[PDB]
Ligand binder design. Structure first.
Ligand SMILES: Cc1cc2nc3c(=O)[nH]c(=O)nc-3n(C[C@H](O)[C@H](O)[C@H](O)COP(=O)(O)OP(=O)(O)OC[C@H]3O[C@@H](n4cnc5c(N)ncnc54)[C@H](O)[C@@H]3O)c2cc1C
Ligand SMILES: Cc1cc2nc3c(=O)[nH]c(=O)nc-3n(C[C@H](O)[C@H](O)[C@H](O)COP(=O)(O)O)c2cc1C
Ligand SMILES: Cc1cc2nc3c(=O)[nH]c(=O)nc-3n(C[C@H](O)[C@H](O)[C@H](O)COP(=O)(O)O)c2cc1C
Ligand SMILES: Cc1cc2nc3c(=O)[nH]c(=O)nc-3n(C[C@H](O)[C@H](O)[C@H](O)CO)c2cc1C
Ligand code: FES
Ligand code: FES
Ligand SMILES: [Ca+2]
Lengths: 198, 251, 408, 383, 446, 206
């Protein structure tokens, strides 16, 4: 029970998805104006990530693994299409299950809840799970840790961009340019955990 | 719209894409295997001193000069088995092919050790001229893998190379420097009492001593790793007994 | 070869399982009923519709546009509805066009909404009650160097129900035009030959819709009297097609009926003792003639009025005898005019210059309290912006000014 | 221009009487507060240089080393000496010939960037750079090249401050955004053991690497052969950066700016609480192979850059929290991260810079949590 | 009893001697037009028309039905109008005693009047302008009511008059005014006072509360925040003690009672005391031969929140009860910011003035420093006693975020509440004008 | 010539990392070396063009329910073929591009163009728009890779330009260029330069 807490702490801090692997930057730098919208999108990404990683681990360890169906046949070229299919189907049925109720969370995200399918955090999490060869419980804890780390990074950037209402930025750097430089300074600050052996 | 229409179009699209993907995936595995083999054959031929340029030259030199075997680590004897298909990194993960290292012997922080190991014998016609041992340990940022080219007396070193490292390139990534690799030639591995005697000195080596090479400048935490790899792998859990057999003349 | 067969079978099965579970979950979750809207919350004229889709297409199927200018994107913010029922979440483009105070009641943009649930919409102000009329052309005499003063009549002699100053939603048929087709009276042809303006040729591919303004008061039945400016691009390259509704008229021979509709009600004169001052705009002078004749005859306003008006030349001038007779019969009226481009052959004995300077240096500077008055304005862009600077420099707050210009 | 004279303006509106403080007085007080640490840092750098040189070389070899480097032959020209019997005057002069070029190049290059941005955006050039330049020149090792110092202050001023708008409008620490650029870009001249003692050919580790190697019994000073006592690490007789070594002078300088209300006792107490709690947790846990788990709080306080960081760099007003309830949390986060990067991260032997640059991102989150609690308390109609 | 811990009692020299002595003969009065929030006048006079006491001078365009009436009987002599023809003052010249009278009632029958009779009496008399609503500090609309009328019966401004000296002469009028306010309001009347005794009304919904501590414990905004927190849909009114004496004397006599007791003080006044003075009087005639030689600035109100009275504004404002005069600090000093400023006042402890307890300063009108950007060293939390977040709130006001400032609490405020945050700011900001721009944005946005 | 303006609109007028924000993760993680920057530019260009062409070919019969599944099936088949070809003939570059030869599926440029322009156009202008957006993306990849590789290791495509100290030259490499903060800063200053040469792309003040 110390091992899974080690995995959670590592996947939140030492191997942050947004600011140590740099995945998801389009929504990370576009939806970062208000902290409440950032909070909602972080919770949505958490749910979709912790659902998508264990199901893809089941599909991989049952079918796509070398010598899993018939000995002598390995089907590890359908990895990408399988992963993106499961992620797209989970996002669609989850947005229907959501959109039944929840005008709180519906139309707060709005256009970007269809756009968390084409979002490199989920595909990177699945591909890194496949690479590192996790079991099912380690897959669940890794997915939840990656989701909470991404939510932490995007809510931090939202808080910084809400503190920056006072600042005076040159006209060429209003918006996207100063957002790029702000994310760069954040990534510079997150290198404190760069050498930890966890 | 129509459920028949959507199911028909998705079946047809899946058939076409699956045909193309499966053809392009099966029809290239031979070339992918050839490339993955050549990427390591180049490093082995380079550490053996035999110069190589071009795929034909690489495969022709490796099939006529290098001859891989399998060695058991504990007993120090030869074990019959397929050489060109063995994967020591993956066999060192399963419990039926690897052992659990306890903390008192695990000086190098690798946490496992495979039951059978692979070496490479540089052939000179009929005679065995060198034996190449792959050693590795933990540095600061990564698991540093390497080769070492030991001559037939089991004591002398003829070359060293580092083919996998993730250190910072200015400080501790100087294990890939030719001026640093060029010091290892001529150094002894053991002493007269047949004990491991490779030292990484801090602040420069003595002028021509046969046991200590120069440490990385400003990079002690990787120099501790480069010391620990040889401190463990020249020990008793590594190539110790096989090196005793080579020293007695098991080649 | 077995790997290819297994790849094909597993690709097809993996895709088909996901398609099946998506369709099953959608058939379990999403609604499939027939949702209903009710116009004005009334049992008559209520409309049933399929779920989803914007409200823009609903009234277009019902037979009115919205009273919109733009359908795409809602950038002009024309489509509005005063909905009291639950519609859903507000969108910031609505909150751009409709401020917080108005949006508190629910004034929302229509095409931004995608109606997928039940709703009773307001849709006020009788936009269902708009009808059409096949207006004939009487004549298109040229009063100025470039102007196109226009007279139309509604078939069988009635009056459009438009409120004062309300321009109709006039449409235009399509026919390709060259300037050589355009018939010109005696004096203006020579200067148009100086600009050799017959040189360009243009094409009218689609019937262009342009809600121009008209030139009579609502009580003047049996005649419609529209208005048209000269169609002219940058005259270095006039090959690009200028002003398709204007060019539809500029060669037109009168007597053909025109299917047009859509009255407006913008110029709401307030019923107070408010001093009215009608600052001129050259082209579009007759909107103010319409509103002043409505205030003279339809409402019989005996309050103090004025018609400061701008002019380039007396050759450019028109409808003089109207305001001359009006100020003759009227006690509380005065009318003036000034030359924008003075020329010697008038030997003019009145004011000259810009309307900005003439109003301030004649009337307003020694006026008692300009902040209590009321100013309507419709004309050239700089000759309106300078006057807005003058009026804000003198007092009057924004709501007391009532602006409406050609294209805003 | 307006440095010598107060401008003689009068107020035009509502408050016809004002205070007496301004950014000139605030930043000049913080600029004067590091003068004891500056003078002691120059003294200690000279002392360590002379002791290392006379431990290594002697006689004609010492004369050849002296006549082959301008820091040594200029110091012997101006009247001092470089033998073992050097006075405090010669030690402070040898520290001055190392520190003052770095201060000069940092001030001139950063002032050029300030003046260029201020002429382009049509403002009047303000203070605060007085603080940033001296705090940058006081935290780099005494053997840092001048071109790297110029690059560091260029990054710190331009990328961290003057793009965001100037004084009072950024969010990071400009003196530490430059040092982090140096630390991650050119780490061969800002880490290791060749760099800290300003000598020629002296390679000897320092107080925080010796502990991480072998515990408190391996704290031996190789220049003299003596051992490092707590009074030595507290007074400031250890190798390190220029003006970070003396906790006594740092406390004496920062007591004044804490008394005057410029520095925040909330942040200082938060940093101290976080350090004490995490170091005590690591002591009680304990380890057999990591020799930093058993380093007490009164040794964590004095070694490395903890006292300089906590006193002068964690109390930056623009980058900190803005709520009294959030300043304690920001300080506690700084202390926890400092002790954690020290103890469990082996690539870096000290972590105050990365602790501050990590908490600067999460300060406005603590602001947001406190002000959202306040907004709920307001909507409940009690505030 | 509510005690205030965060605040500042500003030590400026020239505290008045609280006795009421006669004032000079006043010959001109004026009804300033810019000092009413959101007013757009329609003038009912021109230069030279003879007016009476309580005769209308202008109405309001944006608040219809309210009337602004003249304080004294005489003749209009000037109507000044600034840039964009904004009204500044209506200078009346007093001669005569012609007036418009009203109905009168007994002493005890005041508590049971009809609300509409009360409101039409106040509106026709032009004493309805004494009420300042909260939020937005406007004169309240004639057909709206409120459940809390906050009567300010203390004064913690610097050099301010003592209210007990004034009230102890007109106790019957004060009690009758409180009974009229008790009949006028829907809920209660919140008489806020200090630890001394005041005349009390025997109505059950007139409550007395004791506030102590330094300034701002004597502001209606602080009283509202501690007793009845207001918002966009909860609206409270406000009226000082002199206008309650005016309401009582109006309902007991039928005539508008326009006299005032103002506190003439400052560093440069020879004998600071209280004076009797008509409403809207001329300060240039009030301070005639009362000031030392030297350039001076004649404020109409306290030095924290007061309109500077120079030229067409040289008349006592409506809602101000004191006059404060001080010098002009136009001197350049060599290295003035680096002095051990024993003669320099500050909230912080940089200067050596804080060791000398009990000192008074001859503060001049200079701004010690240029305008710079805001570095929050922690000065606003020292002098804001309310339960807000001062640095965040002021940073939103400077940034221009109306919604966020309203959410943090900038509806309950007025420009005399951020006077201390304007006072202690090292960046030399002026938050009153920023708050007024923000509240005007909220009003215009609807 | 409509094709010239079609392929040269998104190179500086509608750049996918400058005006739109699409395709940033690959821009941060590929530009360490200019060879991998070139290979990624070509691969994204190829995938975007052929994906737009196919989804525009069958754009009439794609249903409203599973349009996402169909588009990701087409893009994923194309990217798997590209990946097999890279692993066969460009193996070392395929090793250096460890996971980002799979993330071309979830790259936002390919799907954003296949949803915005492919479903409502003709196959040949769809192919041209795909090529043009590949070019507009490769421009930013190339410039960031040029600055990062040159100032961080003194090389261009592997060719030695600035001689390092360890070899015996004069240059000491900037170790921050091999980390993603340098990519962030370089993209920020590039947006500054682009929007100060063309001022109609300034974000309006709020
Ligand atoms: C209430 C109201 C009343 C109006 N009344 C009038 C009126 O009386 N008269 C009037 O003329 N308009 C009037 N307008 C404006 C009307 O919308 C215009 O006719 C319209 O802007 C032109 O539409 P078009 O398709 O006919 O122009 P097009 O024929 O498509 O030509 C474009 C317009 O811009 C010019 N133009 C052509 N090529 C270029 C080019 N390359 N660069 C720049 N400009 C070019 C042309 O002269 C032409 O006017 C009114 C608008 C409103 C809302
Ligand atoms: C950014 C950075 C990266 C570093 N990388 C390495 C490294 O890869 N290998 C190494 O041995 N030391 C590295 N170091 C230096 C270590 O921090 C360590 O302190 C150094 O080797 C000094 O050890 P020593 O004083 O005992 O010689 C790095 C330092 C920094 C600042
Ligand atoms: C504010 C501040 C922050 C510092 N941060 C670091 C750091 O993050 N890493 C580091 O190696 N040294 C840092 N230092 C320098 C250390 O104090 C110390 O001088 C250096 O690490 C040498 O290690 P030592 O403690 O063994 O002497 C910092 C110094 C100061 C003043
Ligand atoms: C107590 C105090 C401490 C300060 N510490 C720093 C610092 O550590 N680094 C820096 O660049 N500026 C520092 N400044 C200056 C100022 O805060 C800095 O310009 C802000 O970051 C504005 O960008 C300090 C100022 C004060 C009053
Ligand atoms: S114009 Fe289309 S929604 Fe308003
Ligand atoms: S997040 Fe990488 S492209 Fe959308
Ligand atoms: Ca291994």
């Amino acid at each position: 029970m110390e091992h899974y807490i080690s995995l959670l702490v590592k996947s939140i801090f030492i191997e942050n998805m947004a600011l140590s692997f740099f995945l998801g930057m389009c929504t990370f730098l576009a939806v970062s104006k208000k902290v409440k919208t950032s909070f909602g999108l972080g919770i949505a990404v958490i749910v979709v990530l912790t659902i998508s990683v264990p199901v893809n681990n089941l599909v991989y360890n049952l079918v796509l693994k070398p010598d899993a169906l018939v000995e002598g046949v390995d089907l590890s070229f359908l990895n990408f299409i399988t992963f993106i299919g499961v992620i797209a189907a989970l996002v669609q049925i989850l947005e229907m299950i959501l959109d039944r109720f929840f005008p709180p969370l519906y139309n707060a995200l709005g256009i970007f809840l269809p756009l968390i399918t084409v979002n490199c955090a989920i595909f990177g999490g699945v591909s890194f799970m496949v690479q590192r060869d996790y079991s099912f419980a380690e897959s669940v804890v890794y997915g939840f840790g990656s989701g909470v780390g991404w939510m932490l990074a995007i809510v931090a950037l939202a808080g910084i961009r809400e503190k920056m209402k006072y600042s005076d930025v040159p006209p060429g750097l209003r918006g996207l340019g100063i957002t790029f430089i702000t994310a760069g300074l954040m990534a510079l600050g997150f290198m404190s955990f760069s050498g930890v052996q966890l | 719209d129509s459920i028949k229409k959507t199911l028909f179009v998705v079946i047809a699209l899946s058939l076409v894409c699956s045909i193309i993907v499966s053809a392009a995936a099966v029809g290239l595995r031979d070339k992918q295997k050839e490339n993955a083999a050549l990427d390591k054959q180049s490093k082995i031929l380079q550490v053996a001193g035999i110069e190589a340029k071009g795929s034909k030259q690489i495969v022709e030199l490796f099939n006529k000069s290098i001859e891989p075997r399998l060695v058991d680590f504990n007993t120090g004897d030869f074990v019959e088995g397929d050489a060109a298909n063995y994967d020591q990194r993956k066999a060192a993960k399963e419990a039926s092919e690897s052992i659990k290292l306890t903390a008192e012997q695990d000086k190098a922080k690798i946490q496992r050790r495979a039951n059978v190991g692979v070496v490479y014998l540089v052939k000179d016609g009929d005679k065995t001229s060198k034996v190449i041992l792959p050693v590795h340990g933990n540095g600061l940022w990564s698991m540093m893998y390497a080769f070492v080219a030991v001559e037939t007396d089991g004591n002398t070193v003829s070359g060293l190379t580092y083919y996998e490292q993730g250190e910072t390139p200015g400080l501790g990534g100087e294990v890939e420097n030719p001026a640093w690799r060029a010091q290892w030639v001529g150094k002894k591995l053991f002493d007269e009492n047949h004990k491991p005697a490779i030292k990484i000195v801090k602040g420069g080596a003595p002028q021509g001593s046969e046991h200590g090479v120069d440490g990385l400048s400003g990079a002690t935490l990787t120099s501790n790793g480069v010391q620990n790899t040889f401190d463990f792998w020249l020990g008793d859990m590594g190539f110790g007994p096989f090196l005793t057999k080579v020293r007695d003349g098991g080649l | 070869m077995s790997t290819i067969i297994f790849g094909v079978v597993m690709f097809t099965l993996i895709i088909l399982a996901l398609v099946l579970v998506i369709l099953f979950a959608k058939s379990k979750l999403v609604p499939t009923g027939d949702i209903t809207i009710s116009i004005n919350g009334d049992p008559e004229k209520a409309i049933v519709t399929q779920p989803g889709g914007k409200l823009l297409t609903a009234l277009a199927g019902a037979g009115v546009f919205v009273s919109s200018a733009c359908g795409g994107g809602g950038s002009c913010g024309q489509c509005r509805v005063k909905i009291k029922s639950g519609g859903g979440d507000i969108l910031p483009t609505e909150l751009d066009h409709i401020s917080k105070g108005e949006a508190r009641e629910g004034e929302r943009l229509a095409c931004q909404v995608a109606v997928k649930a039940d709703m009773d919409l307001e849709l006020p102000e009788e936009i269902f009650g708009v009808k059409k009329w096949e207006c004939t052309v009487i004549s298109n005499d040229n009063k100025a160097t470039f102007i196109k003063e226009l007279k139309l009549a509604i078939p069988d002699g009635e009056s459009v129900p438009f409120r004062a100053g309300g321009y109709i939603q006039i449409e235009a048929p399509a026919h390709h035009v060259k300037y050589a087709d355009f018939d010109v009276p005696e004096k203006y042809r020579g200067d148009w030959d100086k600009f050799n303006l017959f040189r360009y040729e243009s094409k009218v591919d689609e019937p262009i819709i342009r809600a121009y303004s008209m030139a009579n008061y609502p009580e003047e039945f049996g005649i419609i009297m529209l208005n048209v400016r000269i169609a002219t691009p940058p005259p270095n390259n006039p090959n690009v097609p200028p002003g398709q509704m204007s060019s539809y008229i500029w060669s037109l021979k009168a007597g053909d009926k025109c299917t047009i509709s859509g009255p407006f009600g913008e110029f709401f004169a307030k019923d107070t003792d408010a001093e009215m001052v009608f600052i001129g705009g050259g082209a579009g002078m007759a909107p103010m003639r319409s509103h002043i004749f409505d205030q003279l005859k339809r409402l019989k306003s005996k309050r103090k009025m004025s018609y400061w008006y701008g002019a380039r030349s007396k050759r450019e001038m028109f409808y003089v005898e109207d305001f001359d007779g009006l100020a003759a019969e009227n006690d509380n009226f005065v009318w003036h005019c000034a030359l924008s481009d003075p020329q010697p052959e008038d030997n003019w004995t009145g004011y000259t210059g810009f309307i900005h300077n003439v109003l301030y240096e004649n009337y307003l500077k020694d006026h008692e309290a300009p902040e209590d008055c009321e100013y309507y304005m419709c004309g050239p862009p700089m000759m309106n912006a300078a006057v807005i600077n003058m009026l804000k420099n003198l007092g009057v707050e924004e709501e007391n000014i009532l602006l409406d210009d050609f294209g805003g | 221009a307006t440095l010598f004279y107060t401008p003689g303006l009068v107020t035009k509106r509502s408050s016809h009487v004002r205070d007496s403080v301004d950014l000139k007085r605030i930043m000049i007080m913080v600029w004067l507060a590091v003068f004891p640490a500056m003078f002691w840092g120059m003294y200690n750098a000279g002392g360590q240089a002379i002791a290392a040189l006379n431990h290594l070389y002697s006689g004609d070899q010492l004369a050849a080393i002296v006549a082959g480097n301008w820091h040594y032959w200029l110091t012997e020209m101006l009247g001092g000496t470089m033998s073992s019997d050097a006075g405090w005057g010669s030690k402070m002069l040898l520290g001055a010939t190392y520190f003052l070029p770095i201060y000069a190049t940092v001030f001139i290059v950063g002032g050029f960037w300030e003046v260029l941005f201020c002429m382009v955006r049509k403002h009047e050039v303000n203070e605060g750079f007085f603080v940033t330049s001296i705090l940058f020149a006081l935290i780099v090792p005494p053997t840092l090249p001048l071109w790297q110092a110029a690059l560091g202050i260029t990054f710190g001023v331009v990328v961290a401050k003057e793009v965001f708008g100037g004084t009072g409008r950024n969010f990071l620490n400009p003196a530490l955004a430059g040092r982090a650029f140096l630390f991650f870009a050119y780490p061969a001249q800002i880490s290791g053991d060749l760099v800290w003692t300003a000598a020629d050919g002296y390679s000897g580790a320092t107080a925080l690497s010796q502990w991480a190697q072998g515990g408190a019994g391996a704290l031996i000073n190789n220049a003299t052969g003596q051992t490092i006592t707590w009074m030595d690490a507290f007074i400031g007789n250890i190798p390190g950066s220029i003006g970070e070594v003396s906790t006594l002078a740092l406390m004496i300088g920062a007591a004044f700016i804490v008394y005057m209300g410029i520095a925040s006792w909330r942040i200082i107490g938060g940093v101290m609480i976080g350090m004490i709690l995490l170091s005590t947790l690591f002591n009680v846990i304990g380890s057999d192979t990591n020799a930093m788990f058993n380093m007490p709080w009164h040794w964590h306080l004095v070694l490395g850059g903890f006292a300089f960081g906590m006193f002068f760099m964690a109390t930056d007003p623009v980058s900190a929290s803005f709520t009294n309830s959030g300043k304690w949390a920001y300080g506690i986060l700084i202390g926890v991260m400092c002790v954690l990067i020290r103890v469990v991260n082996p690539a870096y032997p000290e972590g105050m810079m990365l602790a501050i640059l990590f908490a600067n991102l999460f300060a406005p989150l603590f602001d947001h949590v406190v002000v959202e609690r306040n907004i709920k308390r307001r909507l409940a109609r009690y505030g | 009893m509510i005690t205030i811990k965060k605040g500042l009692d500003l030590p400026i020299a020239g505290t008045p001697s609280q006795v009421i002595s006669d004032g000079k003969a006043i010959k001109k009065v004026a009804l300033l037009g810019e000092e009413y929030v959101g007013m757009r006048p329609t003038m009912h006079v021109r230069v030279g028309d003879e007016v009476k006491k309580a005769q209308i001078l202008f109405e309001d365009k944006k608040n219809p039905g309210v009337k602004f009436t003249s304080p004294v009987s005489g003749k209009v002599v000037e109507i000044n109008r600034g840039a964009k023809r904004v009204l500044q003052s209506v200078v009346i010249e007093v001669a005569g005693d012609d007036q418009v009278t009203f109905d009168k009632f007994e002493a005890n029958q005041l508590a049971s009047l009809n609300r509409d009779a009360i409101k039409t009496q106040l509106v026709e008399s032009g004493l309805w302008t004494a009420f300042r609503t909260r939020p937005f500090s406007k004169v309240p609309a004639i057909d709206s009511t409120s459940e809390a009328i906050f009567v300010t019966a203390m004064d913690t401004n610097p050099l301010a008059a003592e209210p007990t000296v004034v009230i102890n002469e007109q106790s019957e009028a004060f009690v009758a005014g409180l009974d009229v306010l008790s009949a006028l309001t829907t809920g209660k009347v919140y008489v806020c006072k200090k630890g001394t005794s005041l005349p009390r009304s025997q109505q059950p919904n007139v409550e007395e509360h004791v506030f102590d501590g330094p300034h701002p414990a004597g502001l209606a905004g602080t009283h509202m925040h501690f007793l009845y927190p207001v918002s966009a849909d909860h609206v409270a009114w406000s009226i000082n003690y002199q206008d309650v004496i005016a309401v009582g004397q109006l309902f007991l006599t039928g005539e508008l009672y326009t006299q005032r007791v103002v506190s003439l003080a400052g560093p440069v006044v020879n004998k600071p005391r209280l004076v009797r003075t008509v409403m809207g009087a001329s300060l240039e005639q009030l301070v005639d031969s009362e000031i030392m030689p030297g350039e001076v600035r004649i404020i109409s109100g306290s030095v924290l929140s007061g309109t500077k009275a120079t030229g067409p504004h040289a008349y006592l404002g409506r809602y101000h009860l004191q006059v404060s005069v001080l010098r002009e600090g136009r001197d350049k000093e060599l290295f003035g910011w680096a002095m051990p400023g024993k003669n320099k006042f500050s909230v912080t402890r940089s200067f050596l003035g804080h060791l000398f307890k009990g000192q008074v300063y001859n503060m001049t009108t200079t701004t010690n420093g240029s305008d710079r950007s805001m570095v929050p060293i922690g000065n606003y939390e020292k002098v804001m006693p309310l339960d807000m977040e001062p640095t965040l709130l002021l940073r939103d006001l400077c940034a221009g975020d109306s919604d966020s400032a309203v959410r943090l609490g900038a509806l309950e405020l007025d420009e005399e509440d951020l006077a201390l945050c304007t006072f202690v700011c090292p960046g030399k900001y002026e938050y009153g004008q920023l708050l007024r721009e923000c509240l005007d944005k909220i009003e215009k946005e609807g | 010539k409509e094709l010239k303006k079609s392929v040269l609109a998104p190179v500086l007028d509608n750049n996918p990392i400058a005006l739109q924000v699409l395709g940033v993760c690959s821009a941060l993680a590929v530009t360490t070396k200019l060879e991998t920057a070139f290979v990624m530019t070509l691969a994204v260009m190829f995938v975007t063009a052929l994906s737009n062409f196919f989804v525009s070919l069958i754009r009439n019969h794609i249903p409203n329910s599973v349009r996402i599944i169909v588009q990701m099936a087409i893009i994923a088949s194309l990217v798997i073929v590209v990946d097999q070809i890279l692993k066969a003939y460009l193996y070392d570059i395929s090793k250096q591009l460890s996971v980002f030869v799979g993330l071309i599926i979830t790259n936002c440029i390919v799907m954003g163009r296949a949803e915005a322009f492919a479903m409502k156009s003709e196959p040949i202008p769809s192919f041209i728009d795909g090529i043009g957006n590949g070019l507009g993306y490769g421009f930013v990849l190339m410039t960031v890779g040029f600055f990062r590789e040159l100032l961080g290791s003194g090389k261009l495509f592997g060719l030695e330009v600035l001689p390092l100290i360890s070899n015996g030259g004069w240059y000491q490499p900037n170790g921050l260029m091999l980390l993603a903060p340098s990519a962030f800063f370089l993209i920020g200053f590039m947006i500054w330069a682009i929007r100060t040469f063309k001022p109609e792309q300034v974000e309006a003040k709020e």
